[PDB]
Each structure stands twice: as C-alpha cells, then as structure tokens.
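Job type: complex structure
Entries:
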Amino acid sequence: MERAPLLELKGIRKRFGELEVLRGVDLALYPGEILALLGPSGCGKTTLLRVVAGLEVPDAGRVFLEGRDITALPPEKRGIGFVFQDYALFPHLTALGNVAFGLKGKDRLARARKALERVGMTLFQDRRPGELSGGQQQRVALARALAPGPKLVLLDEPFSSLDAGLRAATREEVRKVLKETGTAALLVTHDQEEALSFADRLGVMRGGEILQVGTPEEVYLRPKTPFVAQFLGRTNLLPGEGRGRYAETCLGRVPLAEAREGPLLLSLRPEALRLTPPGQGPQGEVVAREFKGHDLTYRVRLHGVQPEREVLVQEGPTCPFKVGDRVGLEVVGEGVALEG
Amino acid sequence: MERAPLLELKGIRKRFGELEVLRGVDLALYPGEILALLGPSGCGKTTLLRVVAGLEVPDAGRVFLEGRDITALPPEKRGIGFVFQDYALFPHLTALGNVAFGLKGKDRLARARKALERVGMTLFQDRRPGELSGGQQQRVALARALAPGPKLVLLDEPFSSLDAGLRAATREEVRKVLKETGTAALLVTHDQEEALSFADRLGVMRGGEILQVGTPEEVYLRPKTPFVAQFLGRTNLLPGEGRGRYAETCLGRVPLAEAREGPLLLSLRPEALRLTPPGQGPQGEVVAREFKGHDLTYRVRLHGVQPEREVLVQEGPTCPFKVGDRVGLEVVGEGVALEG
Amino acid sequence: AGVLLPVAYLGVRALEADPLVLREILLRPKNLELLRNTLGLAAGVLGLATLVALPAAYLTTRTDLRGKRLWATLLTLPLAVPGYVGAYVLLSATGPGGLLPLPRPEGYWGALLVLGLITYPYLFLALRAAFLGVDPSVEEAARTLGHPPWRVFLRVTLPQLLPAFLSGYLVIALHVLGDFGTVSLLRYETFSYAIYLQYSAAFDRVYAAWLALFLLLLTGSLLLLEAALLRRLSLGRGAARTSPPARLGPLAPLAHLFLLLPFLLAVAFPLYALLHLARRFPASATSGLAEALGHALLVALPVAFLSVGMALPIAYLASRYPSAASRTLERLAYLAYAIPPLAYALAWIFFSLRTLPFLYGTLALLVLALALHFLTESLGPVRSALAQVPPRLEEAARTLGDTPTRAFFRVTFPLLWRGAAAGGSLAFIGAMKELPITLLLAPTGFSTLATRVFGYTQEAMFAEAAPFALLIVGLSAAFVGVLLWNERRF
C-alpha cells in the first residue's frame, strides 16, 4: 500500500539438480497487499514460496524484505509467517500451545488466546489437533502463523482442503483478519473465485518465470496466454488475421486491443458479443441457454465456418431468445491478441 | 407436470437424537425431471436422499415410487440408483466389473459395455479405481448407477469433487445422458449456479423444511420469503409501502411485480438498478466497486437523511463510475413484495 | 550382520560332510513325519484362530456392543500368556491328580488348543483394523444395487478383509513354526521339538542343523507366498465414518458369552489354576525364585536398552532419509524376528563357535541375540512415533523461529522418547519370558523364570513351578494392559 517494496525478488533461479523450476523470477510486493500466484500447476509456485520462506536455497537471485537482503538468512531469522496445506500442526500440543510456539516471551499464553480469539476459537483452545475439524485446524494454523506478528505471510493453498460451502466464508474471514492486522500475504492458489475476490493483485507464472502481474481486472481485460484467459473467465479463442486496428476472424471483423499484424489467436469474451435477429453478418444456431440469474449465457454454433465452431455470448435477463433459434452475431467489445 | 408423480414424499420426518432433521418434508418429482435441492449445510438434504434411497428410516411420512409405497422396503427392493459423493467405488473390481455389479441376466457384460458407451468410456474398462482420475471415477459411478436402468437417480453432489475447469462440460454431459435415458434425477448440491442451470426444478431447504419449489426462473424472479431471496442471489430488502402497482421506498417509486397495498418488504435485485450522474432523484455515494468479471457490483450508501443504508447495483464492465463518486439511483426493474 | 553372518554358517555347518552323508540325512522317514505334523498343527491353529477371531471382530466392530474397547482389551489379553505356561497349565489341570476330572488329551489337541488360544489375537486385531478401515458408502452402494447384507459381506467386505486375513495367517503360522515350549511340554513332534531333541538328547548336531535348514526353508517359502499373495490382491478409508450398527436384540446376552469364552480359557482359568497350585509351594524352593527373578531382570534390562538403541537409528533413517540401507536394515530386523527362535539360537551358537569362541557360553552372546531378536518389537512404537511427526513439522517449527536442534527438541523429541519407552517396555517383557533362546544360549547354571518353569514341568513339579509362572503371567498381563491404555491415550 506504500511506494516502497516490502518483499522484492530479483532474478530468483532454482534447479532441482538438473530440472530448473525457476528461471529468473522477478516480483515486488507491497505492505498490506495480497498477491496470488497462478499457473498451470507446474510453474513452481510452491517452490517460490519455499525459496521466499528460506526453506530452499536459490541457485541465484536476491531476496529483499523491508529493504534489506535476507537471501542468506536461515528460515528462523527472517520473520516470515507460513501456512501449509496440511497446516503442519504439532500433535502433542493443544491448540493454544501451537499458537504460543511462535511467541518467544516464554510462550506467552494471553497473546495466544487473543490470536485464537481473532480467528474465533476460544471454546476449543484446549483441543489437540487430532480432535479438531478442517476449518478449525485452518484457523489454528493461521493464528499460529500470525501470532508472532509478521509483516509477510505466505499461504500455500490454505482453503483447498475445506468443504465447498465453508470456503466462501473462511476466505472472507481470513481476508478481513489479514487486512485489519496489517500484514501482506503471498498466496498460492488454484481457484478462480479466490483469485478474483480474496487477492488484491495477481501474478502468473509460466515454467518458473513471471509473465503477467497486475490487478485482477487488469489481468482479466489484458491477458497474454490462453491459460490466463480461461483461468480468469470463460472466453472465445478464435484463430484470425490482423491487418490493422482490427482483425478478420470467423465471426467477421473484430476490434483489436491495440494493434497486431499477421496470423494470430484472439480472445473475445462472451460479454463482447450480442445476439440479434437473423439478418446480415455471421449467422448461427443457439445450442444451449444457461440461466444464471442476473444474466444468460447462450452458446451459438456458427454456420459459414466449415469446421465446427461454437461461441459463448453473454446476454441480459430479458433476452427473448430460446434454444434452437436462428441468430446473428454482433461484435461490440474489443478482442485481445494473445501472443501464445 | 406429467399428471402422475414418479417420486412423492408425504410428511417425511426424521429425528437424530430428537433433533428433527426433517419437519414434514413433502415433494413430488415427475418423470424425466431433474430437481435440485439447495440449502445451508445441515438442512437435511442428504438425509432426504438417504431416506428416499432407503438408507435411513423415516420416523413418519410415506415415500411413493410409481404409486407404490416403498417406505417399508429395503434398499435392495426399491430399485433407485444412487451416485455417492465419493462415488463409492468397489476397489477390488475393474471399471467394467464395477459397472456390471448391479446388472443381472446372461449378458451382463455386454450391457455394462453399452452403459460405458453411453458415458463414453470403453477404453478404461480393465482399470481398477486406483488407475482412474477423479473426473472419470465419477463417470464410472454414474454408469454403475444407470446400468440397471432405473427410473430415478439420486445424485449426492456428484460434480463437487471435480476440477472447476471441466465442471460445466461434465454437468452438460450428465444432463444429456439423463435426458436421453429418460431418467429423473434428484440432486443435492451447494452451488447455486450449478442448480440454476443443471436442474429443471429447484427446492430451497431450511431447517428440514421445503421453503419454495419451482423452476429456477420462478424461484429467482419471484421468491416468497426473505431467506430465499437472500440465498438464491444478492438482493436489497427494502421496507416500503405498496400503493398499487408501485411502492414508495427510500429509493422512491419502485414498480411492483404484483399489486399490493400497505406496508411490505421489497426484494429489489441489483440488476434492477442503474447509476446515473447526480441529477433530480435519489442520491448516493459509491463506497465499493466489486469486479465479478463480466460485470461489476457497486455498493452505494444513500444520502437521503435516513439510517445508514447500503444498496447493491449491477453494472456493465465499462461503467465509468468509481468509489467515492456522487451518483443517482434509477430503477429499471420491478420489486417483489415478499410474504414477510 | 544381525542375521547375515549367523544363519550363513548354519547352512555351511550342515554342508560339511561326505556327499553320501547329506543324501542319507535327506533320505530319512522322520523328515516327512515332522513336515506333516508341523503343517497339520499350523492348519488346525489357523482354523481355530479364524473361528474365534472373525465373529469377535465382527461383534466388536459392526454391532451395537456395550463397551467395545473393554471387550477388545479382554480379547487381546491372552497375548500375555506364553505357550509353555499354557502347556503347563493344561498338563497340571488335567489327567490323574489334576484340578479338573478330565484325562490329558493327545499331543496334537492340547498343543492346538493352547496355540490357538494364544495366537488368535493377532488375527483378531488385523480383522478389527480391516473392518474399521472400510468406507460404509461402499457397502451402501452395494446394497442400493440390489444386494442383501449377507451377499454384500460376501462380495464387498470379504475382499477387503482378505489382506488382514493374510497378515494374521502369516503371523500365526510363523508363531506355530517357531513355537518350542508348547510342543515340547506336550511332547508333540514338530521341527522345533526335533531340533531340540537332536541337539540336546541325541547329540546329533549335524542332523539338528539340517532340520534347522528345513525350518528356515519353510519360513522363507511362507514369506514368499505371503508376499506374492499380497502383491496379487494389494487393492491399493473413505473417512471411516460411522454407520448404524446391526441390532442384536435377544442375542446380546449370547454374544457376550461368546466374547467371554476365550478370556476365561486363556487368562482367568490359568490364573485360578496357578493360584490353586501355588498353595502347596515348598519353602525350600523360595531361594531359587529370587535368583530366577534376578537373573531374568539382569538379562532383560540390557536387552531392552540395546534393542531401543538399535531401533532408534533404524527408524530415524527409515523415516527421515529413506534409502536402500533403510529397507535392507528393516528387512534384516524382520528376518531376525521371524526366524524360529531355536534355529536362530543354533545359528548363533554355530557362528560363535566358528568365529568368536570367547563369546560362547557367556551372557554377552545371549544379550546380543535377544536384543537382535526383539528389534522389531521395539521398532514398532518408534516407527509409529516417527510417522506421527514428519520432517515437514520440523520445517514448520523452523519458520517460527527455531534452530534445527530446537526444532527437533520441541517437535520430534516429545514423541520420540515416548515411543522409545514403549519399545523398551515391549522388549523388556519379551526378554523376560523367552524360553528357547535363553534355554539354548544361556551359560550353564544360569536359569531365568521361563527356564525354571520348563525344567519343573519337564520333571512334573507343578506346585514348584507355580510361582514362576504366576510372576511371568502377572508382569506380562500388567505390561500389556499398560501399553494398551497408553496407546488408547495416544
């Protein structure tokens, strides 16, 4: 939230013997900022978290925390909280001793109780991890990580193990705890709603290299690779040719983001298309019609295109269209020319 | 409405330690229909599926299948399929052996192969459920449930465990299979977007009671209670005084879907509201701007000298307003006068 | 070198003769009799153990039983009674002049009864774990497809029970193969009894070595068969949620009775018989009871300490740094535990005579052999304690501000030392009641409680042997109960 980088990586590289999992990661984090790392589950995000936490030694690059180099410090001298997938709860301690583990004031217990109260657990503060549920274990792990009062917390897929219904509430509670305490977070996640709502910024990794970092809206509007485009939301990938400010695709003449020439791949979101009564322009048939409340998501199979081609169209709730009707496609939004 | 129900529950009750999980649940499924039950966790949907399947004994009530009472029958004699949340796959059998478990006759294996053809998985027939991904263990479970050819299938959150990338494709494929086989489905799920599109009818459950049953469009557009309106989507619960085909609220004149007189509670959906430059009318200040992807969800605090009230507004992705602005609210839709 | 060197010379010693001598030793009619007797006893004991263990596991797992933990503890208690103590109780409590008005049964039937009663708890525990480790949704799915509960058990539950059946059957068969006290006291002619007779009575060391080689060949074949069957039906929990147990109704008093016949036969009746016999205990023999107890303590303490001191590095290397050395060491420990104790002691005797003659007839050789024999017994709890604390927990402690030494001493040590204590107690009670290795490896004139019981029963002095068996059973039962309670706590 400041103009000075809290966490800053500079050319981080790492080889697992011969396989390079990181290939020059550069990344800057800021106070009170939640940044979520995204990728094709093989880009080395957990490796990045381990390198930042000190649990792994990079083969090159620098790590800066609060303006001072910490790349050579052991994990215990850094002051970076960590939340693991399995919560790494110590089984011989009740869920107050776990929280007091980090506290070096002869294991202060009042502060452990306050930290447990923040995550809303006081009735079960004397229960061992064997007799705790998944959400309760998650809250205990978060309280343990945040009890020593760090300025940076790494979270390795925290809510991925919870139930489907509990995630939406646990995510909001953890976010409000983090924002009221005032600690930056570095999150590794494989979720769309978590990346859209929980995170303040997004960072996308291809093969251990950061390729796109920005606000979730900026990443949604201006993607770079098809994986990012589908990850942020459903989209239409269209082969095409660009000759200027526009491009020629199977749907006709589609506006381009800024400019590109030659053969290319295009991302055109469903909200960038409109359905019209059958007239001129591209024609198609409605194959499906999803009802989502505030909007409808039609699917249209095109006609003039020799190969089979289906496009998604976003429409308002008052659309008087039905499955099997003939439609014409109108392009209102702007496409994004993906690099590949 | 086939004029003759397939599955019909009549006053189903069930007490777990005198907790009364179900309070006189009544239902009437019809041939070929998919009915999805939504609700908060622990509202008795899973208990309802178990009672219908015979896996649990109702304290009172009756269960009718094709007109024949089956309340006292065991699970063997009911003939109702059941897809379990963990897919409940036999680990000592292959996929074809799993599918052929429920079949009888002289040519069980051919029918199991055909049932795998319907799903489209005649490649992994000789693979045990350890050499199988979670997205195809579910297909094996569905083929096993549908292989005997029942008239009703109970689905206990079948798409929850799958990755969100292929969830929609799996849902559409399963719906096509059920529709081509002429099989009615009773679905239990937590996602509202899943049930709003996958199902033919919706049922909201609270505390073991069925609050409202109807098509997803009828339950969404015309809810009856504040809980249903809150649960099936974001809305604004506005106390007002109906005066005919309109109501006078803090936002001014709101047209009513159904005429009413006297004090009442509108459920104004966010998509029924628009933001305009500050002119002559209701006035407010933007306090948030949530990016949902294809659309935006502004939060506006009213400045009409009332107790602090916040209203949600649904806007397009190209909305030029920003937090802290001075805006005027315009009503473009209708409010639903809830029944208390 | 725990078993690689000892049993190496066991085959070398046997293959030291004229080529015609080996043919003559192989071509003896007694070998077929020994094989038939051993296999028949193993089969009968397996059948009896199955008949006792399967219904008990079902009743204590899949039935609304009052006090399942109490019944499980009562059924596991017979593990504390050694085989020779049961054989002595059977001999003293039957026949002419016995406590009961019954004749002494044949050698086969008494040995079968005692061995089944003392070996069924292994199968019982394995079957209980297998029953607890199934997903109830699987049986529910099988039942919704049109299968009544009995056919569900036949076609769903039993295939998942099969690995537990194989494990329990292997344990029981190994115990029957390696048993020496029960068959010797009841004069039943198995391989172990024949080996003891040839080594001690007939003074036929070469033929004893050949019989030991036959016994190790049977043990290896059984292990290979178990491995092949396990790999055939490996099968690869489902949250192990609770399912509504099957109601009993009027069968509740009956089932309890079935759950009381084993414990009464293997624990309560032996205690009553020993207390009835010890009334006529001569005061002249009091001096030899204290000496026997002191000798047993003096052997069992260093054995327990050395067993723990060898189990801790093995378990730590197996968990933290898994390498080929870890599996080799674990397999060596398992072989040391699984080789029949009498052939194991003969291999140790032959090795010590060949290589290290100064160790033969000393307490050091006996202590080392018993420490290697009880390596798995101690290694169990240490394995559990280290598996409950992965190194990722040490990493988590390191992120919180702990150096590697403090991360070890605050996360791993509090469970490591408790596991070490449990393993030490297990090895202590194991070495307190070891008949074969102690009988065959102890110095001349050195006798522990087990050897005194064996010697007194061999000359039919039951009242004299009563206090020794009372001590053995009391300490064994107390330790088993304490360890079971501690495990339930953890």
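Summary: Residues 167-180 of chain B form the longest helix (14 residues). Chain B has nine helices and 18 strands.
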